[PDB]
């Protein structure tokens, strides 16, 4: 995506049509004494993207942003935005069609916000989405139309800020956090596993003495079926020894005993119970649970170490991977815009890079520690130094700067911008600078001046025995 | 019947009276000793608390080494002495005097050693306390009351003497009457007995409520035991009429023995006897058939339980009874004495003040034991007033009106006091002395004051004076 | 996920103060600065949503969590901010019913103007009535000191936000629910928010009072009262603001007639609080005919109760009904019975004798209205007076008939002699003495004044009997120590009486020496000066026309001391002892001057011998009054000896001269003889001789017996009795003889005997029978007093039922023994044990056992025995 059209009519001080054309692909310099001028397209940019959290964006109804709060005849504004849409892989899914994204803010009196995406309504989900699918999102260093104050944070600063700034490319304190919720909700549900537990114990003694009366009903079912054996093979040897008709109808003292012992006690344990299926499902479907459970408790109990271990290996790797990446390109940078000179990140006192990491300079030959032997103008360079290092973590195929220029120098801006066209080729920079006198060597200088209000440019017997 | 009295005293090496110092024999009717004030009087009243042992509350105990003598002149001397004598007089109906014994009757004698020491000798032979209080109450001469003292210190305690005995110590005047009547040592007894009995009474009865509940359960489960020891008799009643048929089929086909003699008339019995009425009963009792021991069991155990708790009610009914009986006997003779007493003081004091009228009342009027008892005054020419809220005089006058009612209830022949009438008027100083005089011939009294009308009508005069710090006692008659 | 919120009913301000899942793990988070910028943003950010107008699930589970966070925050309990948050949100405006719900019903479980705020912008909810109806029931069945507060926000519903929709229904639900009377502290509540809703804003329930019907016929009393309360507080709003309606007018009527019917009601409680209400309803800007002529002829027939807070409430609303009686159109503050009268006859005959027509007759009807109200006042006057003969009501009741008798009344007089007699607590009796009966007018002078005041004492001073007057000279003297009557009242008093000697036709000549006598009775100064005014008045040329003037002087010339004994003082007095006889008066005068002359002179006795000298020597009076003069003399020689002899025992005597010297001579060897208005000085002299030495008793006692029981003059037999009661004194048991004169023929006889008989047993004092027999007899006086002796005594009570059980079979009384055994049975022992088993140790009669059942003459014995 390359920024080379410019489409601002209809706001608090672009009232008319002002040519805006001739950019640059490679450094873009938007210079002049109107600062308000040019911090109108921002501020229409912002408006555009829908943020409302800067001191100079927020307002109390959305009128104020239209001139004069829309009562001065310019009762609407209406912006458009042509962004060049040629690189197909950062463009959003399903919107590779149009090769040029244009998009159309309209707002009129009443606070009602227009949506349009190449001529679509789209509620702010949709635009949500679209946003987060080019890096895109509202708690990070992205957002390029504006960054914050971070610059004059940066004076007086101690490790704390190079730890964040580190660990916006780590980012484990996010995972420290969910990863302590997520040890309380388990710590929480562990009462509700005890509770299962407890009464998969009192559930298993019924089917306990379920499985006993069934054993014990089938062995008085087989007692009986062999009294009746018994029985029956007397009667048979009874009928080949031999008043018959009795003896064809029904058809040794201790066998006639055990028979009538096994007969009451198949009378006496009775044990009626003619869903055994069901039991035997009931006792299947009970052990499938059990199993269950148990698996997902060694599951869990082994994902926690698992999760423990792989923590600290990918801690340790990205801590060396961090402290060497990050510190060579600071070196570089340091290196390549201040000439004869180096700086590096050290510990504090015998620390740790846990423990956090301080920047030592060198001014010139003499190697300086903490950034108040140095003046305003190097603290500034440096900061803007450290922001332009920082936003290679999360790239964009623009950038536009606002304002953080405050005291540099000139051969230290001609560097700077050396570098930009040799290092940074391949990213369309725009610059706002506040201070004159600078950049000299910029390809392209847009004086933007204030002007007009607007800036411009028997058989059985023998069978059983 | 004769009556003990005292001839005269002897002292040696007193306090105050140093030496040997031997007083004149007194009068068989009436005596009086007289000094002047501050004269050592207080000496004489010391010494006689201190030989009937009745030791005054305002010197500290074992302290009697002060009664030796101790002065300037003399500060260590051997031991102190006292010494009186007793003997018997008649008193007849017309003025003479007759004698039982020429002899002298008793010496009593204390003496008194410097280390604290103390011993009494009756008949110049040493003795205890005991057997000479014993004699003397066999005399007639009771030491457990001072009936014989009077003294101020009475006057003001009777003057805030509470109806009962709200202080610990102090006796009412409730107990002041008890002990005027000499049933004073039984209503304390009868009341404790009265609370500890009747405790006990009210926690047994509770626990033979308690054994009665328990009965009542006991007998709740009989009410269903009978009930199975019936059936349990129907059972065993219809297997024996079951065994008699079981041994008739088996004679047939030829208590239990006779009825299987008498199955196999016989014959006509065992066919007649309602085979078909035997076989239904015989079915019934197999259908009802498809607690002995309970009169021997706990059911009796607890009958014996509601029998003892009923026996033990029944004796502390009879216990209570007792004590109720023993409550009821004091009050007759109470209130029977009560009025002896109240019409001798009313008396006493129409004769001797001719105004006003004293009398103690109770503060209600049916519970003698209730509150307390009052004593109201009215004076000549004025109204009904409290005890408390009067003079020194009708105080006073109130009190020997009393002491005076009492030795009327029961007979003293020795009575003392001294400065009892001290500023009053003349009036009633002339009553007491020729009420004394006259009215009392049987006693010997003896009368200490200032007052002219004294010593004008006394029959023996006992001067005591004070020379160079010692005291000597002169005795002599009323002859003019 | 609004079922499962209501079921389950730092790194977070890096994303919150500049996502589902992100939201929901800061709600999560949450659960006092970071919270107040929280809810700041959050309603201001809600406010912005709102105005600007799929994405209303996100925010309504943002309230959910937002106010489920506050109700667990208020409850687990800086309020001032989340207050202030509250008010933000509400005021920007299903799950709505859940969210008041929520937001209410922890709110009243915790529970000045935020709270204020919270409730008011909490009513906005449209629809739900039934919702905040049952919170509201609930707070009023559960909570006792909120439900005024509810009064409150009915307050900011009825005319801050003028909204009668959400108010008629409100009271249309209230006043058709249902009560119940065994609701504890929950009738209380509820009267005291229907009183607060009637005392801050009356005028929307009066709207739906066709349906509190049912209300004013409640059982308890607390709803009762907060009616009669509200629609007091109504009528007070509907005459203030007239506005002027006709169905206003009807319902004023008809709870007129509510109030007309329940003032009867059978509860003191009720009563005052209607009372209340009348009264400060009756004061308003209206004329009310009709309505106060009802009010009082309804009051003055209920002012005789048997409470005592209703009484003087009731004395209260005649108080405040008289002092702003409509009748002053002509001649206002005057009720003078007599002009109300005359002007009715002159109405009366000039119209047996058309605009004129219309005036002439309102002029009579307003007449009667005024001569009705007139006779009511006058019948409430004589009731009260005789009602009143607790002291609050004493105290309190005064300044009604004060101001009563402050118009000019026909009752005048026999109020003021009604009211002496009544008052004998002082300071107030004192005061409004003070403050009429010694009135100042400014419009006269001093002169004017003091001799308006003279003219008021004369005219009330001389009009009573001799009791009354002492008691109001008593009450005087002990009224003037402050020195009221200035030096000028005095003088002028003093020149009215030099001027006496001579507007005074026989009515105030004598008042004026009797009001002179009973303001020397308060300072002994005032009859030591101007002893000449006296001399040539009381003891001169007038002292031979009127002998009770003579009689008045010698009492004010004796009241001097509490002259060098040679004026012509001593001398007039001797001269005018001289004999008066032939008239019938003459007697207390004699009576008073021999006692004046003795007690304060030189030396009595030689005078004393002069006079029984000069006396002797002369058709019976006069022999009467010689033996009265000699018996006066000897008691007065008694007394002076008496006096004489305890001034010589308090100078700080023989005790020969007191108690012996009374065998002296002059004898009564004459006086006897005449008796074996003739014989009455007789019979007085000879029951008199009985203080000689006492020996006169118990020489002639059967004499003076036999000539006293047989007499026919009640006076004879009074006096009698009277001797013997005070003979009592000084002692001799003359018992079981002055007990039998207790019921003669005549009333005044028993009057005096019994007098005499409880006099007697307070100092110097069985047969207790016929004072109880005397109980149920005639002459209701006499039963007063023997009801007042028996309560008077009781400061033992078995001796006098003991006395009474055994008297009872004397078979003289019937129909009058239960009434006795009653009146006897008032004043308890304290005990109730031993009376008790000592009537069930013998008992006969069946009286004893109704009478056992009714108070006393245990329960199982005495079911046994009976």
């Known amino acids: ?465 | 019947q004769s009556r003990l009295f005292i001839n005269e005293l002897v002292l040696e090496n007193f306090k105050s009276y140093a030496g040997k110092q031997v007083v004149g024999p007194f009068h068989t009717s009436f005596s009086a000793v007289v000094g002047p004030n501050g004269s050592g009087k207080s000496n004489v009243i010391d010494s006689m608390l201190f030989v009937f042992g009745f030791r005054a509350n305002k010197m500290r105990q074992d302290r009697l080494s002060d009664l030796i003598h101790k002065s300037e002149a003399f500060p260590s001397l051997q031991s102190c002495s006292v010494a009186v004598h007793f003997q018997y007089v008649i008193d007849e109906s017309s003025g003479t005097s007759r004698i039982d014994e020429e002899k002298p009757g008793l010496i009593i004698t204390r003496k008194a050693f410097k280390n604290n020491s103390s011993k009494y000798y009756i008949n110049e032979k040493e003795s205890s306390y005991t057997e000479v209080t014993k004699l003397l109450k066999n005399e007639g001469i009771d030491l457990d009351h001072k009936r014989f003292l009077i003294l101020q210190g009475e006057v003001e305690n009777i003057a805030q003497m509470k109806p009962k005995a709200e202080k610990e110590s102090d006796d009412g005047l409730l107990e002041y009457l008890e002990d005027i009547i000499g049933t004073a040592n039984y209503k304390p007894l009868i009341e404790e007995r009265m609370g500890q009995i009747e405790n006990l009474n009210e926690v047994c009865l509770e626990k033979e409520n308690r054994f009665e509940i328990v009965d009542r359960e006991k007998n709740s489960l009989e009410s269903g035991k009978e009930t199975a020891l019936e059936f349990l008799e129907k059972e065993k009643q219809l297997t024996l009429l079951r065994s008699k048929l079981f041994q008739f089929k088996l004679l047939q086909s030829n208590s239990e023995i006779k009825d299987a003699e008498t199955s196999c008339l016989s014959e006509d019995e065992l066919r007649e006897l309602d085979v078909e009425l035997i076989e239904s009963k015989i079915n019934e009792l197999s259908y009802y058939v498809e607690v002995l021991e309970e009169y021997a069991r706990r059911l009796a155990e607890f009958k014996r339980r509601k029998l003892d708790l009923n026996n033990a009610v029944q004796k502390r009914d009879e216990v209570k009874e007792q004590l109720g009986i023993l409550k009821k006997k004091r009050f007759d003779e109470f209130m029977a004495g009560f009025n002896i007493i109240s019409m001798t003081l009313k008396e006493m004091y129409q004769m001797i003040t001719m105004g006003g009228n004293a009398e103690l009342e109770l503060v209600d009027s049916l519970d003698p034991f209730s509150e307390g008892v009052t004593f109201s005054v009215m004076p000549p020419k004025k109204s009904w007033r409290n005890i408390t809220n009067l003079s020194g005089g009708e105080k006073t006058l109130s009190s020997l009106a009393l002491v005076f009612a009492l030795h009327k209830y029961k007979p003293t022949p020795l009575y003392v006091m001294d400065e009892i009438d001290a500023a009053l008027d003349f009036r009633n100083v002339s009553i007491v002395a020729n009420y004394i005089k006259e009215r009392t011939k049987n006693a010997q009294f003896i009368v200490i004051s200032l007052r002219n009308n004294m010593f004008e009508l006394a029959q023996q005069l006992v001067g005591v004076y004070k020379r160079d710090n010692r005291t000597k006692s002169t005795t002599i008659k009323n002859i003019d | 996920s609004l079922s499962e919120y209501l079921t389950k009913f730092r790194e977070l301000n890096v994303i919150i103060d500049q996502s589902p899942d992100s939201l929901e793990a800061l709600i999560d988070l949450c659960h006092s600065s970071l919270s107040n910028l929280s809810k700041d943003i959050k309603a201001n950010l809600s406010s912005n949503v709102n105005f600007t107008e799929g994405l209303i699930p996100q925010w309504k589970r943002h309230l959910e969590e937002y106010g489920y966070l506050i109700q667990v925050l208020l409850t687990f309990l800086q309020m001032e901010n989340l207050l202030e948050s509250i008010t933000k949100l509400l005021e920007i405006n299903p799950e709505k019913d859940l969210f008041i719900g929520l937001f209410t019903r922890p709110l009243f479980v915790l529970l000045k103007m935020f709270i204020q705020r919270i409730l008011a912008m909490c009513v906005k909810n449209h629809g739900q009535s039934s919702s905040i109806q049952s919170s509201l029931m609930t707070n009023l069945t559960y909570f006792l000191h909120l439900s005024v507060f509810n009064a409150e926000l009915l307050k900011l519903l009825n005319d801050e936000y003028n909204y009668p929709q959400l108010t008629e229904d409100i009271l249309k639900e209230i006043s058709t629910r249902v009560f119940n009377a065994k609701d504890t502290t929950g009738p209380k509540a509820i009267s005291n928010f229907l009183i607060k809703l009637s005392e801050l804003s009356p005028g929307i329930m009066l709207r739906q009072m066709n349906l509190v019907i049912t209300l004013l016929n409640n059982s308890s009393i607390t709803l009762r009262c907060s009616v009669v309360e509200a629609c007091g507080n109504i009528v007070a709003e509907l005459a203030q603001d007239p506005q002027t309606m006709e169905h206003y007018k009807q319902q004023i009527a008809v709870l007129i007639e509510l109030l007309e019917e329940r003032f009867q009601d059978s509860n003191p409680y009720v009563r005052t609080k209607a009372i209340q209400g009348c009264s400060k309803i009756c004061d308003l800007s209206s004329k009310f005919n009709k309505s106060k002529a009802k009010f009082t002829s309804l009051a003055v027939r209920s002012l005789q109760d048997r409470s005592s807070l209703v009484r003087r409430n009731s004395v209260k609303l005649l108080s405040k009904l008289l002092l702003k009686h409509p009748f002053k159109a002509i001649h206002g503050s005057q009720l003078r019975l007599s002009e109300w009268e005359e002007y009715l006859k002159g109405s009366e005959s000039q119209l047996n004798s058309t605009s004129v027509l219309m005036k002439l007759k309102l002029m009579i009807v307003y007449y009667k209205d005024a001569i009705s109200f007139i006779k009511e006042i006058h019948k409430s006057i004589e009731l009260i007076s005789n009602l009143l003969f607790n002291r609050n009501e004493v105290l309190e009741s005064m300044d009604f008939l004060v101001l009563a008798d402050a118009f000019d009344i026909e009752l005048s007089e026999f109020g003021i002699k009604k009211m002496l007699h009544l008052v004998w607590i002082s300071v107030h009796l004192i005061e409004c003495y003070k403050q009429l009966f010694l009135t100042a007018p400014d419009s006269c002078n001093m002169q004017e004044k003091a001799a308006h005041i003279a003219k008021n004492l004369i005219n009330l001073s001389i009009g009573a009997s001799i009791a009354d007057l002492a008691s109001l000279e008593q009450l005087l003297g002990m009224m003037y120590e402050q020195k009221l009557i200035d030096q000028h009242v005095i003088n002028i008093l003093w020149a009215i009486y030099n001027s006496a000697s001579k507007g005074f036709s026989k009515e105030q000549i004598h008042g004026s020496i009797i009001i002179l006598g009973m303001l020397s009775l308060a300072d002994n100064e005032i009859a030591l000066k101007g002893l000449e005014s006296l001399l040539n008045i009381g003891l001169g040329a007038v002292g031979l026309k009127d002998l009770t003037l003579c009689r008045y002087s010698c009492l004010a010339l004796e009241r001097m001391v509490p002259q060098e004994l040679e004026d012509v003082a001593v001398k007039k007095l001797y001269a005018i002892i001289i004999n008066y006889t032939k008239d019938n008066e003459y007697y207390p005068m004699c009576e008073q001057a021999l006692s004046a002359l003795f007690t304060i002179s030189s030396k009595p006795d030689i005078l004393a011998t002069d006079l029984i000298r000069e006396k002797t020597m002369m058709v019976v009076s006069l022999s009467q009054l010689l033996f009265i003069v000699g018996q006066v003399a000897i008691k007065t020689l008694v007394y002076l000896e008496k006096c004489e002899a305890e001034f010589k025992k308090r100078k700080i005597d023989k005790e020969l001269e007191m108690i012996g010297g009374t065998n002296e001579d002059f004898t009564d060897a004459i006086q006897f003889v005449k008796e074996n208005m003739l014989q009455r000085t007789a019979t007085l002299c000879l029951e008199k001789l009985m203080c000689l030495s006492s020996k006169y008793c118990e020489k002639s006692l059967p004499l003076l017996i036999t000539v006293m029981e047989k007499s026919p003059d009640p006076t004879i037999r009074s006096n009698a009795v009277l001797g013997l009661g005070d003979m009592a004194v000084c002692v001799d048991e003359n018992t079981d003889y002055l007990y039998r004169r207790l019921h003669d023929e005549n009333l005044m006889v028993q009057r005096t005997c019994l007098m005499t008989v409880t006099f007697l047993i307070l100092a110097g004092q069985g047969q207790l029978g016929e004072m109880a027999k005397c109980l149920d007899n005639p002459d209701q006086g006499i039963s007063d007093m023997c009801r007042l002796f028996f309560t008077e005594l009781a400061s033992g009570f078995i001796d006098i039922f003991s006395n009474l059980s055994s008297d009872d079979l004397l078979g003289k009384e019937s129909f009058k023994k239960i009434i006795k055994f009653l009146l006897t049975f008032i004043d308890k022992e304290r005990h109730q044990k031993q009376l008790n088993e000592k009537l069930v140790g013998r008992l006969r009669k069946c009286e004893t056992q109704k009478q056992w059942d009714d108070i006393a003459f245990x329960x199982x014995x005495x079911x046994x025995x009976x």
């Open chain 1, 1 to 465: 995506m390359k920024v080379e059209e410019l489409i601002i009519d209809g706001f608090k001080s672009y009232a008319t049509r002002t040519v805006i054309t001739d950019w640059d692909p490679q450094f873009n310099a938007i210079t002049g004494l109107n600062g308000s001028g040019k911090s109108n397209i921002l501020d229409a940019i912002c408006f555009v993207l829908g943020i409302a959290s800067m001191s100079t964006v927020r307002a109390s109804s959305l009128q104020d942003l239209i001139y004069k709060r829309g009562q001065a005849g310019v009762t609407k504004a209406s912006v458009t935005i042509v962004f060049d849409n040629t690189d197909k892989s950062n463009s959003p899914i399903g919107f590779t069609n149009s090769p040029q994204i244009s998009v159309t803010r309209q707002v009129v009196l009443g606070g009602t916000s227009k949506y349009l995406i190449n001529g679509h309504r789209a509620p702010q989900q949709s635009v949500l989405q679209l946003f987060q699918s080019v890096q895109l999102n509202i708690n990070n260093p992205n957002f390029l139309i504006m960054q914050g104050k971070i610059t004059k944070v940066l004076n007086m600063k101690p490790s704390e800020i190079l730890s964040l700034i580190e660990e916006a490319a780590g980012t484990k304190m996010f995972e420290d956090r969910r990863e302590k919720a997520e040890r309380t909700m388990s710590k929480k549900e562990t009462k509700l596993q005890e509770n299962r537990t407890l009464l998969t114990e009192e559930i298993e003694p019924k089917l306990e003495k379920l499985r006993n009366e069934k054993r014990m009903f089938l062995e008085f079912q087989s007692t009986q079926t062999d009294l009746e054996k018994t029985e029956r093979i007397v009667v048979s040897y009874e009928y080949y020894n031999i008043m018959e008709k009795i003896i064809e109808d029904l058809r040794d003292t201790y066998r006639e005993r055990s028979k009538q012992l096994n007969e009451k006690f198949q009378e006496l344990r009775k044990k009626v119970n003619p869903n055994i299926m069901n039991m035997i499902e009931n006792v299947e479907k009970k052990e499938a649970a059990l199993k269950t459970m148990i698996k997902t408790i060694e599951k869990d109990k082994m994902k926690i170490q698992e999760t423990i271990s792989k923590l600290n290996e990918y801690k340790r790797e990205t801590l060396v991977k961090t402290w060497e990446k990050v510190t060579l390109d600071f070196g570089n940078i340091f290196a390549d815009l201040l000439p004869n000179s180096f700086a590096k990140l050290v510990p504090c006192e015998g620390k740790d890079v846990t423990q956090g990491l301080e920047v030592k300079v060198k001014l010139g030959n003499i190697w300086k520690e903490s950034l108040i032997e140095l003046s305003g103008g190097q603290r500034s360079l440096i900061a803007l130094s450290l922001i332009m290092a920082l936003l290679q973590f999360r790239p964009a195929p623009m950038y536009i700067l606002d304002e953080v220029d405050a005291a540099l120098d000139l051969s230290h801006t001609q560097n700077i911008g050396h570098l930009i066209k040799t290092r940074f080729k391949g990213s369309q920079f725009i610059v706002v600078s506040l201070k004159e006198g600078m950049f000299a060597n910029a390809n392209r200088v847009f004086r933007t001046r204030f002007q007009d209000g607007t800036s411009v440019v028997x058989x059985x017997x023998x069978x059983x025995x």
